[PDB]
Structure formats: structure tokens, C-alpha cells
Please model this.
Amino acid sequence: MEDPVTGPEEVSGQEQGSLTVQCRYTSGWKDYKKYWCQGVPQRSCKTLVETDASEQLVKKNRVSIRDNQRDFIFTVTMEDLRMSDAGIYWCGITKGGLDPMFKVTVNIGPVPT
Amino acid sequence: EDPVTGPEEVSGQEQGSLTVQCRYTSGWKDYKKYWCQGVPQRSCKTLVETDASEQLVKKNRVSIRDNQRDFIFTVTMEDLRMSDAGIYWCGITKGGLDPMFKVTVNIGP
Amino acid sequence: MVDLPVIQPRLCTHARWPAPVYGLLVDPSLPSNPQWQNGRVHVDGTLLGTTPISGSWVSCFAAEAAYKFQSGTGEVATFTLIEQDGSAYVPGDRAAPLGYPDFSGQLEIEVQTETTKTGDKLKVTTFEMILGPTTNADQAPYQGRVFASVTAAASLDLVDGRVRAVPRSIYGFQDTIPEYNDGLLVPLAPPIGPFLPGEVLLRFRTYMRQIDTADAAAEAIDCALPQEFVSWFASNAFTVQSEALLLRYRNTLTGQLLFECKLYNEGYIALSYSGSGPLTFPTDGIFEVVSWVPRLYQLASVG
Amino acid sequence: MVDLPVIQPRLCTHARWPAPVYGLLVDPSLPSNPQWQNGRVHVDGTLLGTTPISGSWVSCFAAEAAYKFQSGTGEVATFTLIEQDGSAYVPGDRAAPLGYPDFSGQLEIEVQTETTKTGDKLKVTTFEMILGPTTNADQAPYQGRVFASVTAAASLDLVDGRVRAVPRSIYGFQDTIPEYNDGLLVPLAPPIGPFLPGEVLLRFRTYMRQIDTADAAAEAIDCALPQEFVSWFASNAFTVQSEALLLRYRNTLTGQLLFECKLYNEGYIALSYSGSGPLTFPTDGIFEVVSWVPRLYQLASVG
Ligand SMILES: [Cl-]
Ligand SMILES: [Cl-]
Ligand SMILES: [Mg+2]
Ligand SMILES: [Mg+2]
Ligand SMILES: [Mg+2]
Ligand SMILES: [Mg+2]
Ligand SMILES: [Mg+2]
Ligand SMILES: [Mg+2]
Model:
């Protein structure tokens, strides 16, 4: 890979279900904190979960994040989805100054029939 | 489509000549056509201009003739000097912003 | 002794965003004690916060710019801040260099850039810069360092040099102070106030060039005094004799008195207003000094 | 009591381009009697040319914008000018709306645009606008109509509406009046002058964000007085007693007298200078009024 971090450009989930986002990153950022961010403007977004630069799973409210530092992928899970969860999110790597970030648009809808 | 089109680049030799064909669409038949020089674009220096007829006009080393059957006015530059290289424009005179096409002139020895 | 410039508000300059004053209003539903850092001045001429004398400094900054390309981000600018007159910026008793934006959101800025690419030399590049309220960019204008970026597929081959960033647009505006020091507290001018019961802040309003993907509503920003008044007091350095000045806002051609208000010495104007909704005023009047009055002077209510 | 604001030039606002004052100089090689239309004010407060009171009006204009796409040109904007406070512009005894650029070249302008495309609504659009000296665009700001354009492969789907155009950059700058009326003459403020033998115009200098594909040299632009002095005189409406005011320019921390000069009541400053090349002065001094003097008062020369 060339860009520091990439993920799904757009994902769609449904009320009460879940969805999973794979944030792939280049090996150089192995030992950096990974995080999942919400909202725009981009760099004032609300951090929902953040790792301690390890592979330990972190869960906060309905959001989990686990860094695979062998395959260089940190996976994010949003459970028990609500309509209010729709919006713009960010795969993130913490560093001094401007973080590497990839925009993930999350659509949420009701379960049809 | 574009009111006026020409060659993006034309070349000539020093002391030689070059010719440029400014093609335009039928609607601009009865408009004055001109050959302009320099930048900024819309303060360019007009070198020759027609009177909206097919009569050939010449001023110094530049001449222009509007072919109103084929809708092409042709420009010639003679005795090409090294200083003649730069940006020129096919031009149609109208109220407000003139239709213009950018032609870069290059000149080798 | 104190007098004011004979200039209608609509002909004055806004003190927090570089644009004309367009509105004059009170609105009890807005924050009653804003902590604005520009447009802050004492009636004795003392500049507060980051307030500059010149209106052209408002919401701008000067810097030594250093550029570099980062894949996934674009051309990144590290701005080592200076004062906008070229003198060194030294972190001290204010939040940032004079005139630095005192609001939040994502700001488009424009700077002179020089490139090394053949057939090109000078041009103006638009950068994006997150101001606040909180950011993951570690903005620290208090320490003299802020970061901005512009999308780009490859390096713009920019030459490092001096710049003055001027504001192009705001995105996600919030009238709360920006990130001055990576989340740490900085020296700030205190919130505007206090007010007597029934008193509300008089607001001079302009509107900010905006990026908004859904809504066409104009982005309002208020300040306590137009820039002409800021420069007026800074220059005259009047001697203060009480707690506040009784002003009359009057139409110069009809003599009609529109309202009376109190210009507190700390640089803000209060009106007595009991309503709950906003009340806008005509912008073609003239403020005139009546006399000194104490803080407890009770104004005649408006509307 | 006639006096000047106690502000150093380096802290002042330029009166012809919205930016700080960076330089103070004389230059006998430059046009000695410039016909600048902004930054022109009589000592008695009378504004001349298109001079505005607010510096934010300088080199800007407001208008009702009508947009259309023209294949081969891009997005075309027809600006029907208004005054920047929103009031109607009526062709009268000046060249254009207040603040309109009084220089030539190709100006980039920024306006708020609303689009009908989905996922986009409000953004800021950069347009290109030729000012002068002569153009084939038939610019007529005197009549209240100017034209701008921007390259675009297809319509930007812009909504017609009101704008305030602010200057982004200058291309091919020339300090000569723009096309005010499709090449015809318009009411102009007179050229600056006259000067006594040995007297030359004192210049307040800033620099303009520039597009230049070959030369990195900064683009200088001068004005007769900083904007703070323009608004100072308009507000005070002093009574003029003679042809000029004798001023002294001092460093107030050391008291050093840098030079004496004459502020003619027509709003320009003269120094007695014999050299042929430019002479710059420190910008951290203060102009102080000494007295009224007659036109023939002979100043002491500088270097
Ligand atoms: Cl504006
Ligand atoms: Cl600048
Ligand atoms: Mg960071
Ligand atoms: Mg931080
Ligand atoms: Mg909005
Ligand atoms: Mg034309
Ligand atoms: Mg014309
Ligand atoms: Mg240049």
C-alpha cells in the first residue's frame, strides 16, 4: 500500500444489526495508536474508541476496535446500530500534527420487509 | 460547441513565416475577427482586426483574412523574430467577454 | 472627554471577521458572556486578548511556512507563526499572535506560494486548517505552530518562505474559542460582562463566506465593537472617570433617538431589553457620548 | 485641535489593497503625481474618488450576480454592482462604487456561490476578472456592470444572487486606473500634487498576493495615507487653516526625529528629497502634528 490508511469508502448497516470496518494501514504505522472517529469537520471529529498502540481489544459503548499488527489492519465494530449512527466516520492513526485519516461514510436504514 | 478554435501551438522559423487557422461557428460570420498578443488575456494587444468582411487586413508583419463560407479566418505572421514567441489569441469581437482561443507561438532559429 | 468616531455601523469594519458590519442587534438566546479574543479593548485604549489595531489582521496570521508532501494527506504546511508586521511572535500574556482567529470550525486560508516547477513560479494556494474547538491536529498558535494541508496527488514543489494567511471560507463554524495550545489552557481575555439584570450585549454582526453542503443560510458572527472603535480607543487613550459611558444611538438626519445604552469601560455595550427574541436595529445611526455613569445606572428599555 | 492617530505605520492598514502597511519610502523614479482613486481624503474629512471609510471595502465590490456557462469560456458572471453596504449604486461624481479597485491587471476574486447540484450547496468560487488598463471585455463599473469568468468544463449550476467580491490575487499588475467605462472617461479624483521643487510623494507600501509564472519578485503597491488616517479625517471633519500641516516623524521610544514633512490638506504627504533612487524609512515611528504652514514652507531635506 502507498496511502497510510485506507478502508471501505461506504458501508450500510441496519437498525439493531452491526457492521464491521477494516482499516488497512502500511507497516510503518504498526506501533501507533489506532482510532475510530465520528463527524465533520474531519480533524475536530469525536474519537469513539482508541487503542493503546497494542493489539488489545478496546470497547466503548457500542464500538470496538482491535489492531492486527501482523496483517496491519485495525478492525472496528459498531453494534446495535441506530439511525442516529449514520454519518461520516474516520479510520485514524494518532501522531503529532495531522493524523492519517480515511473517510468512511456510514448509512443506516430500517430493516425492510 | 466552442465559438472559436485554433491550434494550441504553432511553430515557425526565424525570418520565416507561420500561418494560423482560427475556425469558428456559423453564428459568428458577421463579427469582427482579430489576432491578439500577450497576457493578461483580455488586455492583450490587438495586432490585426477585420471589419467583419472577407477583406484581407495587414498591419506590419501580420495579416488576417476571414473566410465566411468555411468560417475560418486565417492569420499570417511574416519575418518571424525570436521576440515573436509567446502567447497569442484567435479573437471575435462582441459586447462583453470576447470568444478567444489561446495559441502559443514557438520560434526556432 | 471621551468621544466616538462619527461613523455609521453599516460603514464600519467588523472586528472578528474581515468584512463590513451588516447588522446591529441584541439576542437573549445567544451566549450572554462570549469570550471573544478579538475586538476586545478597554475604553482607555488597552487592547485585550489578541485584538490588533489594523482590521486587516483580523482572522489572519503570518508565518514562516515549511511544506512537505504526505501521501493520504497532500501538501502539508507547518506554519511557525510570527506577528503580522514581521516581528517575532513570543508566547506571552495572550492566546496567540494578534488577529489570530478566535472562533472554531475548518478555515480555508490563502497564502502566497512559490513553486520550483518549470513554467510556474508564483501563485496563491488555498489550504485547509482546522481551528477548533478540539482537534487531533495539535494546533498550538500560542506556542507559534499550526498545521494546514491541501489535497494533492503529488508534491506541489513549494518553496519554504514567509506568508500571511488570509481567510477564504469557514466550514462548520462554531463561536467558541479555538485550539490555542493542543488542548492546554492559554491566557485569555475574560468573558464579556457582567451585565445588570435586564441588560444584554449589543452585537455588531457580519456574515462569513461559507462552505456548506446542504444549507444556504448565511453564517453570522458577532463582535462587541467595530474595528474603527477599537482603533479609536487604542489611539486616543482616554482617561476613564467612572465605570461606564451613557451612549445615545441616534439618526443623524432626523435626530430620532433610537435607543440609549451603556458602553462599559471593559469594552462592551449593554442595552436594557426584556424580550426573549432577537431585536435588530437600523445600522445607519451614530453613537454619541452623553456622559459617564456608574455601573448601576439603569437604562431605558428597548422594544 | 487637529491631530493624527497615534499608530505606527507598520500597524496600519493599506488604503488601496486590503493588507498591512509594510513599507514607508520615497522614490523619485516612480510616477510623481499618481491618480489613485482609493485612499484619497481631504484633511477636512471629504472623501475623494472611490475612497471608502472601511478598509474592508478596499479593492472589493458588491453586486447582484447573474451566472451562465459559455462553452469556450467557462462559467461567466455578470456583476450588476451595488455599494458594499447593500445600497443601490447610482453612476455619479466618481468612477465606480466605493472601494472598487483603482489599479490594473487581471484580478482573481472570491464570491459566495450557491449551487443546485446535490451534495453541494454553499461554497466559495474563484473568478478571474480583467481590470484594465484597456480590455476587450467592456468593463463598465462606472455604469455598474462588470464581467468575470472562470474556466469550467461544464456549468457550475450556480444560483443567481448577491455577492461581495474580495481580492485573491493579482496577475500582471499595473498601477494605472482600470477600465471604468469601456474606455471612456469618468469623474476622477485629480492626480496627487502639486509639489514644491525638491518635494516628492511619501509612499505607504504593501505587497499584493500575485500570480507570476516566471518572477518571484513581490508586487509593490503604494497609497498616500494608511486607511486609519482616511477614517480619522472623515470622522473628525477638522477645520483646515492653511495649505498644509507640518508633521514630524519620530521614534517615540528614543525621540529621534526621522524627518519632517508636509501633509497637504488635499491628503498627501511631501518630503524634500534630492536623491534619484528610493529611500525607505523605518515603519515603527509616529507622525505628530506641529503646526499649519503655507504652501511655500520649505522643508529640510532627507538623506
Ligand atoms: Cl464578505
Ligand atoms: Cl497580505
Ligand atoms: Mg495528530
Ligand atoms: Mg492534540
Ligand atoms: Mg451552514
Ligand atoms: Mg468584448
Ligand atoms: Mg470595449
Ligand atoms: Mg511579477
